[PDB]
Amino acid sequence: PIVQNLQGQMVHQAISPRTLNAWVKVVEEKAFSPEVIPMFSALSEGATPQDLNTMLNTVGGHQAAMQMLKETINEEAAEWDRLHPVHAGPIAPGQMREPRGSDIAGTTSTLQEQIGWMTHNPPIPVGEIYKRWIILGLNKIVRMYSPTSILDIRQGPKEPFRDYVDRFYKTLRAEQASQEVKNWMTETLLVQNANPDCKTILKALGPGATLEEMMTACQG
Amino acid sequence: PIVQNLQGQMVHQAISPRTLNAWVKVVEEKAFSPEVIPMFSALSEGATPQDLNTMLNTVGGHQAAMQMLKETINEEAAEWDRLHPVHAGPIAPGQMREPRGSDIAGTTSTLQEQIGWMTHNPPIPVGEIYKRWIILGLNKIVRMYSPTSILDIRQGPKEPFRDYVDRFYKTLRAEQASQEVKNWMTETLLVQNANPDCKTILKALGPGATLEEMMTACQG
Amino acid sequence: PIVQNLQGQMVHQAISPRTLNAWVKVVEEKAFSPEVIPMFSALSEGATPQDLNTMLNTVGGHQAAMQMLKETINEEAAEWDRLHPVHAGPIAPGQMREPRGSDIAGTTSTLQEQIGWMTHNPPIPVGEIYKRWIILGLNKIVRMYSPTSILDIRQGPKEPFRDYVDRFYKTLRAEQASQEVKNWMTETLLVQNANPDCKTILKALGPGATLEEMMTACQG
Amino acid sequence: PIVQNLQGQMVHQAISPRTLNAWVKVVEEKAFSPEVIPMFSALSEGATPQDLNTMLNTVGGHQAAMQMLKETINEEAAEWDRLHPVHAGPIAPGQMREPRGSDIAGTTSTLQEQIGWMTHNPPIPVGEIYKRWIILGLNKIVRMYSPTSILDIRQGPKEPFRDYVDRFYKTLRAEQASQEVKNWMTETLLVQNANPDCKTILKALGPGATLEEMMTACQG
Amino acid sequence: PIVQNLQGQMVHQAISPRTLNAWVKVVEEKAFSPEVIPMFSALSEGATPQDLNTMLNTVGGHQAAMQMLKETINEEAAEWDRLHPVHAGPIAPGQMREPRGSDIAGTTSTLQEQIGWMTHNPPIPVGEIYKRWIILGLNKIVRMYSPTSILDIRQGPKEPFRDYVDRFYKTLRAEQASQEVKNWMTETLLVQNANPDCKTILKALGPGATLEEMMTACQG
Amino acid sequence: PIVQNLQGQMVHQAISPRTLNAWVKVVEEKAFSPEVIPMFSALSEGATPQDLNTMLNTVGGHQAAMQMLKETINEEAAEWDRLHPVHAGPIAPGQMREPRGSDIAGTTSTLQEQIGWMTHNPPIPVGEIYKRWIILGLNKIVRMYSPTSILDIRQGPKEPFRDYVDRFYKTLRAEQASQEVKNWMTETLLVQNANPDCKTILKALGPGATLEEMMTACQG
Amino acid sequence: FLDGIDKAQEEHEKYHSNWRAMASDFNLPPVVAKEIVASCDKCQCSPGIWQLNCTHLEGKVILVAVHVASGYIEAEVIPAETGQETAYFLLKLAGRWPVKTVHTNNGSNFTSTTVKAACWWAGIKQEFGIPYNPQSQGVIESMNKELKKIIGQVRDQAEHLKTAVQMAVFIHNFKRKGGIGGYSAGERIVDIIATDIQTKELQKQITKIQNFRVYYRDSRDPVWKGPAKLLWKGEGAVVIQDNSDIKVVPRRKAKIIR
Amino acid sequence: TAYFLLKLAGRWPVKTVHTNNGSNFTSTTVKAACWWAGIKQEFGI
Ligand SMILES: O=P(O)(O)O[C@H]1[C@H](OP(=O)(O)O)[C@@H](OP(=O)(O)O)[C@H](OP(=O)(O)O)[C@@H](OP(=O)(O)O)[C@H]1OP(=O)(O)O
Ligand SMILES: O=P(O)(O)O[C@H]1[C@H](OP(=O)(O)O)[C@@H](OP(=O)(O)O)[C@H](OP(=O)(O)O)[C@@H](OP(=O)(O)O)[C@H]1OP(=O)(O)O
Ligand SMILES: [Zn+2]
């Protein structure tokens, strides 16, 4: 990617094979899950849009996700073009106009244009906008890939509650909702689907009982 | 490969053994597919033709494809000789002569004159031309290695729609054609060969429907 | 992370993929043993809070501990806000205003603000405060995953005392108490939960004898 | 090995353990197959004869091939000594006489002699000559280690043409001869040694057809 | 850890995760054997006491050894305090006072103190003193870990003397004594406790015989 | 290891963990064989005697050979002291006397003395003499570790000559003798210790020939 | 069929075994086993398969054919390595035993036009390569080496090579008792052929059944469901399949329509 | 406990196991494994 030098200006270098190998292996070994959402960002810091597309294209299988994210990239490019109108007229020497909807995706822009835009004054966060579009695509794809809702989780008749609440929280994180909805469901849903003994213990604890007391009470 | 020093100049370096080892192992462990096209292009960036042919020759197995791509390289060299005029006569000293069909293939050009071509003014991107020739050859090879065509795709009575659309897009990527016909196919063909229930569902959906709505409605 | 340049000044850098991959794999592989507490501080030194969040969010499963640490971070931020009054008024550039309960966690602060805080004179160890909050969260996670207390370990009738003392100290390091109580318990329980021959040797040695002489004399 | 210095004087460079480990593992792993010929030339670029000897002696087992290559090295060193005229006259400081048959092999010559020969103007390609000698030795070793001829390959009546052509080209590369004979055999034996149906298909296709045409026609 | 920069002053460096992982795995997997003592000095050259403490506390299991090492570190800190009286008075400008007993252990001193001490003129090798204390702890823990002494080892009549002399040397090197005492042991006990046939053969050969002729004397 | 800066001075550095780990692993998994002798010489270029002794002491098991090589080092140091003139009395400023018997072994001389000797004018190849002493010790060790002699090997009735000549050369390489007798014995008994059919075939081929013909005739 | 369909479905969902295994284990017709196997989303005749091998003894070629389900042996020495004699032996064994598929290995004489014509006339599908059964590869070679062991033992008491070889193969087929069961190879092969005849009688009985659209009612519900494909009728009940589900209903809760 | 039960089933044919009403013996994993293997359960000895 484009990273700083030792007390020098920003310079471009090829993507390290280790990074892309780790990305593709963690994509293939682990299914689409929320934990891959931040990891990708940690692997895409200061990366040009061309490098992002190169990393994206190496994914093998699950082409439906690729088509979904390409469609979302196209629609976001159209939104950016219509909200930020395409200015007309010649550009002064030493300057280039703002990247278009096709330019951010890298389909109609070369690496030299990306380098010029990234280091331009004022800076052009085209790569950051492409990264956030990819983040939105990943959010909707992990919404798609989640096979179960949050209202159909019930603890077993004698199943330990540890992994039950663990998977409940795991499914809750993959749910696209609001903060207050999450608070309500973590206040009410978990107690309505528990084993009778420690669920009545929780009902005795009353509202506001944090998970530490609830887990120390449901012991055994 | 040719690499730039930190705030320095362009210098040649030997190929790291890990890069070629990863290339050969990913070639031998993964069957030929379009996703190997970016993987090859992300590793051979800024590489002399000598490195390109050493990486190409180290591949073990499927040597019929190697012979086919060598034949296409030879025919592309002939095309370059026949369309780009051959500058007859001895060029004046101080300027590197026009690369031949063998020179671009690396079969007769040593590393010293390759570096001279790299540092010539104006720069001569012979390595990029050879890389694009290799890309075309690999496209022909992956076209050859396509297990089946695209018009015979049919969703089984018990086949899930997810796997059906995944393999449909896999074969669509495996198809070599223009973007317009790709759009026409992805807009018309997939709905024709689906299961009757989802066929009627998509017919009720009508035209101008994104694939996310189709896949959400086809569930069950 | 924040790495000092070669005979230069401190410059910001992103977390290497190898370090985060090793951290996540070592966290997910075996268990939430107390030994993760030192190794964490061996991988998150001089790191901005957002990179701490990125390393935190990559954990696979075990979301109950994640909720625990998030709630403890929120309550500690509230305590920090209530104990330290907000400094209002105009703020000079280069030295930004006091961070809030959301700025310390980095959920609202950006990279530039964190860099400014790091380079601010007087120094702002907000990253260190977040790290020590994470240390407390890890301590209570170890408490959550502690199999049992120390008050029930009894040496076997024929079990060698080596494994007994080893597991006693293993449980002791996971205990949450003051140092004086730990010294008292390691002085008392060891002699009160031993085999008859080892305990008679201990009482022959009398009080004030360290474990060295104890387990060199109880040998045989 | 001998590494060029950035606008300075070249100096000896230590051999990385990665190259030795990779070389020994790839040698011990699969076979004395032709694919080791390029790999070796990728792991010994610009290496001193001492480095080549060190790489040679690292192998374990299969000492018969080592004896073969040692005998060939001895005979070709004798040939080089008998063809190259013996240097006569005083040797000025900063220069050295032509390396002996034992010196090119590196058995007796020290690293200082190799450095002096490299820094001599014009440089003596002793390393390149020894490398091509090793290449010839490996070629004849692979010739010995091929347990099949080119004229004995038969295609089963229901055997696909794919693996037939694959093995045909494997044996073609395993066989060493003039290029014209290789072209003649790959043009004649391919059609002449196939199943009757595809044989008549190729006869209908006519002579000089590219292998892509025949492989597409023989399908079915 | 602490590494001098090329053409520059010494600068603090973060701990390599691979080094820590290799250290912890080699400590946990093989044994508490003497050969790990030199390896420690290979992985602890030029490091702050905090680095040594982090390396020590990351080990899993064998917590009795860790407690013993901590107690010996405390007693050596007390010894350092008693040998070097606590100098009172104002701190010299730019010259921090010598580390205390708790300062060498690093439990009460921030990293900046060690950073200043390492680069201070004259240099203060407090880290080397801590390393030597750890070496003494390793010596005593490997002494107590040895299950058998050297005065009771006996050779069975139904096995070759190879493994007997091997284990004799294992026990000899596992015990800490003067060099002359070790020479006397390897001169007397190697022949005073052998099999009778080999004992008589060596008595016939006479004293002052090397181990090579000793082992080649009674083979089988 | 101590290394020379490009167009600069000679700076001492610590041994990389990779080299030591590879050395100990290859020692463990590849129990003493001739091919390990070059390996050490590939992993000890430009290394101080302290580094050599450190990597020597890290070995685990087979301490009888370690004591043998230690004794040979001591006796070679005594020989060096008794042969090379030992100088005493005043020492010229800016220079130090040559290393003694204890200094070359590294038992008494400090690392700074080795650093000064390596950079001295003229340089002192004490490290290389210690390396060649270790080479001689390893040669005698591998001579000791020979499973059997070289004149007793035979070929089984159902044993192909391939692995027969392989083991013959493997055992022959483990012989420390002159090259002339090696050539004499490898030309006569290599057929006298084989199966009668190929024996008579080789005898009919003529007394003595190139081994390639003798192995091609013996094929099958 | 006493609730064995549910057991077979559970066993195929947990193991996905061969249809014949379920048919033999639960005493069911092969049709229900085949339909249960086809119901599996990840899934899609041992008698009558013979294996041929060639060996060299006393400087002469001997061809031996062996069955897979029973291991019955036939062997003959051929004066000269020609495809005509192998074709003759193939047609003779076709005219002596019911052969459906001839499996062999790679061979120049096996790919002759004469043997191809001979097998095309008989309507027997021939192939060579990996054995059809994933197991019992070593059975053929073990039997061949047992025959090779016994021919050398019985050669001294015979005057001709062919007579000795035939006597040895006769002893191996008849006068050599095995392990489990402990009887002749002829007995096991005739039992296999008899069970094949019985299964073909079952097949023709199923062929007697046809479309015969049948409606069904369950648990005396007021509604009538269907149509459902008829599988079998007997013992006062009818077993049918519909929507990849096989169930047995009493006759009083069903109707049959021509 | 379920792991040991499935291992012993894989090493020997078991049709019935006699255990007490312990939580480990009646655990969800053990019950699932024994029902998958078709092994009858009897509580009380
Ligand atoms: O190629 P291998 O023989 O399998 O060895 C690899 C290789 O290390 P080396 O290049 O030093 O041999 C990996 O490095 P990369 O190829 O990923 O760059 C390394 O991975 P990390 O360096 O990222 O740790 C991996 O270690 P691991 O298996 O723990 O992932 C390690 O394998 P070994 O540890 O078995 O040598
Ligand atoms: O420590 P060195 O012997 O000089 O080798 C390093 C080391 O790689 P290994 O640990 O696999 O040997 C670096 O990894 P870190 O120690 O920084 O984690 C790696 O850096 P990357 O991980 O970014 O690849 C670097 O490679 P580079 O110089 O390209 O940055 C590579 O040096 P070599 O590639 O020369 O062996
Ligand atoms: Zn199935």
Coordinates of N, CA, C and O in Angstrom, one line a residue, chain H residues 3 5-7 10 16 18 20 26 28 32 38-39 41-42:
Chain H
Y3 N -17.5 -38.2 24.4 CA -16.4 -38.6 23.6 C -15.9 -40.0 23.9 O -15.7 -40.8 23.0
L5 N -17.7 -42.3 25.3 CA -18.7 -43.3 24.9 C -18.7 -43.5 23.4 O -18.8 -44.7 23.0
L6 N -18.5 -42.5 22.6 CA -18.5 -42.7 21.1 C -17.2 -43.5 20.7 O -17.2 -44.3 19.8
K7 N -16.1 -43.2 21.4 CA -14.8 -44.0 21.2 C -15.0 -45.4 21.5 O -14.6 -46.3 20.7
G10 N -17.1 -47.0 18.9 CA -16.3 -47.2 17.7 C -15.3 -48.4 17.8 O -14.9 -49.0 16.8
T16 N -26.5 -51.5 25.1 CA -27.1 -51.0 26.3 C -26.0 -50.6 27.3 O -25.0 -51.4 27.5
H18 N -25.5 -49.3 31.4 CA -26.1 -49.1 32.7 C -25.4 -48.0 33.5 O -24.2 -48.3 33.9
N20 N -26.0 -44.4 36.3 CA -26.9 -43.8 37.3 C -27.5 -42.5 36.7 O -27.3 -42.2 35.6
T26 N -26.2 -38.3 31.8 CA -27.4 -37.8 31.2 C -27.2 -36.5 30.4 O -28.2 -35.9 29.9
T28 N -26.4 -33.6 27.6 CA -27.0 -33.5 26.2 C -26.1 -34.1 25.2 O -26.6 -34.8 24.3
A32 N -27.2 -37.3 23.0 CA -27.2 -37.2 21.5 C -26.3 -38.3 20.9 O -26.7 -38.9 19.9
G38 N -27.7 -45.4 18.3 CA -28.7 -46.4 18.6 C -28.5 -47.3 19.7 O -28.7 -48.5 19.6
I39 N -28.0 -46.8 20.9 CA -27.7 -47.5 22.1 C -28.8 -47.3 23.1 O -29.1 -46.1 23.4
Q41 N -30.6 -47.0 26.7 CA -30.1 -46.4 28.0 C -31.0 -47.1 29.1 O -32.2 -47.2 29.0
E42 N -30.3 -47.4 30.2 CA -30.9 -48.0 31.4 C -30.3 -47.3 32.6 O -29.1 -47.3 32.8

